[PDB]
Amino acid sequence: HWGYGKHNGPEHWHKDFPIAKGERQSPVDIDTHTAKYDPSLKPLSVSYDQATSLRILNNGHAFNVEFDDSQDKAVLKGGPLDGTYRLIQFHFHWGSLDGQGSEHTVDKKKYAAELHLVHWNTKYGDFGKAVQQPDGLAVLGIFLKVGSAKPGLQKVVDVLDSIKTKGKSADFTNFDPRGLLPESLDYWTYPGSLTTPPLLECVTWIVLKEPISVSSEQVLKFRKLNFNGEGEPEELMVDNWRPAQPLKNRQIKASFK
Ligand SMILES: [Zn+2]
């Protein structure tokens, strides 16, 4: 029922999800001037060598690559985090044009897309319990700009036709998510929310400073997807991003000087 349409869009979500107007909503604009370096931030640790992708699916607002999270096969640690966070899925938000698509912005600068690697705190036993907690989730956010191709993206791009419409999934094994990372893991962090309903405020955001480059051909394959189910009138899956939300009380910290 909720979506990115003129009618069911971000501006109207509060109607069914009144936390949309809460104090810790994501995304936010990252003002480099006010976001200060914190030398007590530790570096990111990502152990992804045993990462086990299972499937890719079109859920009608994006596509999710899903991972076996029954063990610490693919985990995020350090940075601002206490304890171990298991990767459950990743997905993207993107725009209709290159000049937009990101959810977070940097001094109002919008990127072409934003990749989210979603992890959940093993303190709580499973994802379902984790989302009910303020320290429940860590999402690694990675900006996309258009330019050079991303080799490690191509495995994903190359299946997208097989899941064009809402409802469709396909097997997707032996995908390595290290292949979606940039060279520097310098980051900004701040407490926030899910950017889609139910918009729970359960996320330590970790937004990487260095964008990854992707090819024109790569982003266009994204834009070929459909929100609609098979048979319906075609609405292309584009502009599946939420605009910057009020920062309110919160401080954004930088891992770098
Ligand atoms: Zn997301």
Coordinates of C-alpha atoms and ligand atoms in Angstrom, one line a residue:
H1 CA 0.0 0.0 0.0
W2 CA 2.9 2.4 0.8
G3 CA 5.2 3.3 -2.0
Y4 CA 7.1 6.2 -3.7
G5 CA 4.0 7.4 -5.6
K6 CA 2.5 11.0 -5.5
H7 CA -0.1 9.5 -3.2
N8 CA 1.5 6.7 -1.1
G9 CA 4.9 8.3 -1.0
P10 CA 7.3 9.4 1.8
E11 CA 5.3 12.5 2.4
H12 CA 2.3 10.5 3.4
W13 CA 3.9 7.6 5.4
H14 CA 3.3 9.2 8.8
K15 CA -0.4 8.5 8.2
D16 CA 0.0 4.8 8.9
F17 CA 3.5 5.0 10.5
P18 CA 3.4 7.9 12.9
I19 CA 7.0 7.3 13.9
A20 CA 7.8 8.9 10.5
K21 CA 7.8 12.2 12.4
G22 CA 9.9 10.8 15.3
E23 CA 13.3 12.1 16.5
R24 CA 15.6 9.6 14.9
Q25 CA 14.4 9.4 11.3
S26 CA 16.7 8.5 8.4
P27 CA 18.0 9.5 6.0
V28 CA 19.6 12.9 6.9
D29 CA 21.9 15.4 5.1
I30 CA 25.5 15.1 6.2
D31 CA 27.0 18.6 6.7
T32 CA 30.7 18.1 6.6
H33 CA 31.2 21.4 8.5
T34 CA 29.1 20.4 11.5
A35 CA 29.9 16.7 11.5
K36 CA 33.0 16.5 13.7
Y37 CA 35.8 14.0 13.9
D38 CA 35.7 11.6 16.8
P39 CA 39.1 10.0 17.6
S40 CA 37.5 7.5 19.9
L41 CA 35.7 5.9 16.8
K42 CA 37.4 2.6 16.0
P43 CA 37.9 1.3 12.4
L44 CA 35.3 -0.9 10.7
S45 CA 35.9 -4.7 10.7
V46 CA 34.1 -6.8 8.1
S47 CA 34.6 -10.5 8.0
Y48 CA 32.9 -11.6 4.7
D49 CA 35.0 -14.5 3.5
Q50 CA 32.4 -17.0 4.5
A51 CA 29.4 -14.9 3.3
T52 CA 26.6 -17.1 1.9
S53 CA 24.1 -15.5 -0.4
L54 CA 20.9 -17.5 -0.9
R55 CA 18.6 -15.6 -3.3
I56 CA 17.8 -12.2 -5.0
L57 CA 14.2 -11.0 -5.0
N58 CA 12.0 -8.1 -6.1
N59 CA 9.8 -7.0 -3.2
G60 CA 8.1 -4.2 -5.2
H61 CA 10.2 -1.4 -3.7
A62 CA 13.7 -2.7 -4.5
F63 CA 15.6 -5.9 -4.9
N64 CA 17.1 -7.7 -1.9
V65 CA 20.1 -10.1 -2.0
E66 CA 19.6 -12.3 1.1
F67 CA 22.2 -14.1 3.1
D68 CA 22.3 -17.1 5.4
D69 CA 22.5 -15.5 8.9
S70 CA 22.3 -18.7 11.0
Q71 CA 26.0 -18.2 11.9
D72 CA 28.6 -15.5 12.1
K73 CA 29.4 -16.1 8.4
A74 CA 29.4 -12.4 7.4
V75 CA 29.7 -10.0 10.2
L76 CA 30.3 -6.3 11.0
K77 CA 32.2 -5.3 14.1
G78 CA 34.1 -2.3 15.6
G79 CA 33.5 1.2 14.3
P80 CA 30.8 2.6 16.6
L81 CA 29.4 -0.9 17.3
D82 CA 29.6 -3.1 20.4
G83 CA 29.3 -6.8 19.7
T84 CA 28.7 -8.6 16.4
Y85 CA 26.2 -7.7 13.6
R86 CA 25.3 -10.4 11.1
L87 CA 24.5 -9.5 7.5
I88 CA 21.0 -10.5 6.5
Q89 CA 20.5 -8.6 3.2
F90 CA 21.6 -5.8 0.9
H91 CA 19.6 -3.6 -1.5
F92 CA 19.9 -0.3 -3.4
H93 CA 17.9 2.9 -3.8
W94 CA 18.3 4.7 -7.1
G95 CA 17.0 7.6 -9.2
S96 CA 15.4 8.1 -12.6
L97 CA 18.3 10.4 -13.5
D98 CA 22.0 10.3 -12.5
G99 CA 21.6 13.5 -10.5
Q100 CA 19.6 11.8 -7.7
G101 CA 18.9 8.4 -6.1
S102 CA 20.8 8.6 -2.8
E103 CA 18.9 8.8 0.5
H104 CA 21.7 10.4 2.5
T105 CA 23.3 13.5 1.0
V106 CA 26.6 15.2 1.7
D107 CA 26.2 19.0 2.0
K108 CA 23.0 18.6 -0.1
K109 CA 24.9 16.7 -2.8
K110 CA 22.8 13.8 -4.0
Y111 CA 24.4 10.7 -5.5
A112 CA 23.1 8.4 -8.3
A113 CA 22.2 5.6 -5.9
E114 CA 22.8 4.3 -2.3
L115 CA 23.7 0.7 -1.4
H116 CA 22.6 -0.6 2.0
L117 CA 24.2 -3.6 3.7
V118 CA 21.8 -4.5 6.5
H119 CA 23.1 -6.3 9.6
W120 CA 21.5 -7.3 12.9
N121 CA 22.9 -7.4 16.4
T122 CA 23.5 -11.0 17.7
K123 CA 22.8 -9.7 21.1
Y124 CA 19.1 -10.2 20.4
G125 CA 18.9 -13.6 18.8
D126 CA 17.2 -12.9 15.5
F127 CA 16.3 -10.1 13.1
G128 CA 12.7 -9.8 14.3
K129 CA 13.8 -9.1 17.9
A130 CA 16.7 -6.9 16.8
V131 CA 14.4 -4.4 14.9
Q132 CA 12.5 -3.8 18.2
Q133 CA 15.7 -2.3 19.7
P134 CA 17.6 1.0 19.3
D135 CA 20.9 -0.9 19.1
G136 CA 19.3 -3.6 17.0
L137 CA 20.6 -2.9 13.5
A138 CA 23.8 -1.6 11.7
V139 CA 23.4 -0.6 8.1
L140 CA 26.5 0.2 6.0
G141 CA 25.5 2.9 3.5
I142 CA 27.6 3.3 0.3
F143 CA 27.1 6.0 -2.3
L144 CA 27.0 5.3 -6.0
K145 CA 28.3 7.6 -8.7
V146 CA 28.2 6.9 -12.5
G147 CA 31.6 6.4 -14.3
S148 CA 33.8 3.3 -14.3
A149 CA 32.1 -0.1 -14.2
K150 CA 32.1 -2.0 -10.9
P151 CA 33.4 -5.6 -11.6
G152 CA 31.9 -7.1 -8.4
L153 CA 28.5 -5.6 -9.3
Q154 CA 28.2 -7.5 -12.6
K155 CA 27.0 -10.8 -11.0
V156 CA 24.0 -8.9 -9.6
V157 CA 23.3 -6.8 -12.8
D158 CA 23.3 -10.0 -14.9
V159 CA 20.3 -11.6 -13.2
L160 CA 18.0 -8.5 -12.9
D161 CA 15.9 -9.5 -15.9
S162 CA 15.0 -12.7 -14.1
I163 CA 13.3 -10.7 -11.4
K164 CA 11.7 -7.8 -13.4
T165 CA 8.3 -7.7 -11.6
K166 CA 7.2 -7.7 -8.0
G167 CA 7.1 -11.2 -6.5
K168 CA 9.9 -12.7 -8.6
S169 CA 12.9 -14.3 -7.0
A170 CA 15.9 -16.4 -8.2
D171 CA 18.7 -18.4 -6.6
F172 CA 21.8 -16.3 -6.0
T173 CA 24.8 -18.2 -4.4
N174 CA 28.5 -17.5 -4.0
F175 CA 28.1 -13.8 -4.3
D176 CA 31.0 -11.9 -2.6
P177 CA 29.8 -8.5 -1.1
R178 CA 33.4 -7.3 -0.5
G179 CA 33.2 -6.7 -4.3
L180 CA 30.8 -3.8 -3.6
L181 CA 33.1 -1.9 -1.2
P182 CA 35.2 1.2 -2.0
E183 CA 39.0 1.6 -1.3
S184 CA 38.6 3.7 1.9
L185 CA 36.2 2.7 4.7
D186 CA 36.3 6.2 6.3
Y187 CA 32.8 6.8 7.5
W188 CA 30.2 9.0 9.2
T189 CA 27.9 7.5 11.9
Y190 CA 24.7 8.7 13.6
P191 CA 21.7 6.9 15.2
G192 CA 18.7 6.6 12.9
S193 CA 15.9 4.6 11.5
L194 CA 14.7 2.3 8.7
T195 CA 14.2 4.5 5.6
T196 CA 11.1 2.4 4.7
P197 CA 8.0 1.5 6.8
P198 CA 7.9 0.5 9.5
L199 CA 10.6 3.2 9.9
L200 CA 11.6 1.8 13.3
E201 CA 14.5 3.7 15.0
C202 CA 16.8 0.7 15.4
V203 CA 19.7 1.6 13.2
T204 CA 23.3 2.7 13.8
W205 CA 24.0 4.2 10.4
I206 CA 27.5 3.9 9.0
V207 CA 27.8 5.9 5.8
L208 CA 31.0 5.6 3.8
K209 CA 32.7 8.8 2.5
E210 CA 34.2 7.3 -0.7
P211 CA 31.5 6.5 -3.3
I212 CA 31.9 3.5 -5.6
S213 CA 31.9 4.1 -9.4
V214 CA 29.4 2.1 -11.5
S215 CA 28.9 2.1 -15.2
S216 CA 26.1 3.8 -17.1
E217 CA 25.1 0.4 -18.4
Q218 CA 25.0 -0.9 -14.8
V219 CA 22.6 1.8 -13.5
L220 CA 20.3 1.6 -16.5
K221 CA 19.7 -2.1 -15.7
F222 CA 18.5 -1.0 -12.3
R223 CA 16.1 1.5 -13.9
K224 CA 14.6 -1.3 -16.1
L225 CA 13.0 -3.0 -13.0
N226 CA 9.2 -2.7 -12.2
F227 CA 7.4 -1.9 -9.0
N228 CA 4.3 -3.5 -10.5
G229 CA 3.6 -7.2 -10.5
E230 CA 3.6 -9.2 -13.7
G231 CA 0.7 -8.4 -16.0
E232 CA -0.1 -4.9 -14.5
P233 CA 0.7 -1.6 -16.2
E234 CA 4.4 -1.0 -16.1
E235 CA 5.7 1.4 -13.5
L236 CA 9.5 1.4 -13.7
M237 CA 11.2 1.0 -10.3
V238 CA 13.0 4.4 -10.1
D239 CA 13.3 7.1 -7.5
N240 CA 12.8 4.6 -4.6
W241 CA 14.5 6.9 -2.1
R242 CA 13.4 8.9 0.9
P243 CA 14.4 12.6 1.2
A244 CA 16.6 13.9 4.0
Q245 CA 14.7 14.0 7.3
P246 CA 15.2 16.5 10.2
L247 CA 18.4 15.8 12.1
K248 CA 16.8 17.2 15.3
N249 CA 18.9 16.6 18.4
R250 CA 21.4 14.2 16.8
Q251 CA 25.2 14.6 16.1
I252 CA 26.9 13.1 13.1
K253 CA 30.4 11.9 13.9
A254 CA 33.3 11.4 11.4
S255 CA 35.8 8.6 11.7
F256 CA 38.3 10.7 9.8
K257 CA 39.9 14.2 10.3
Ligands
ZN1 ZN 17.7 1.0 2.2

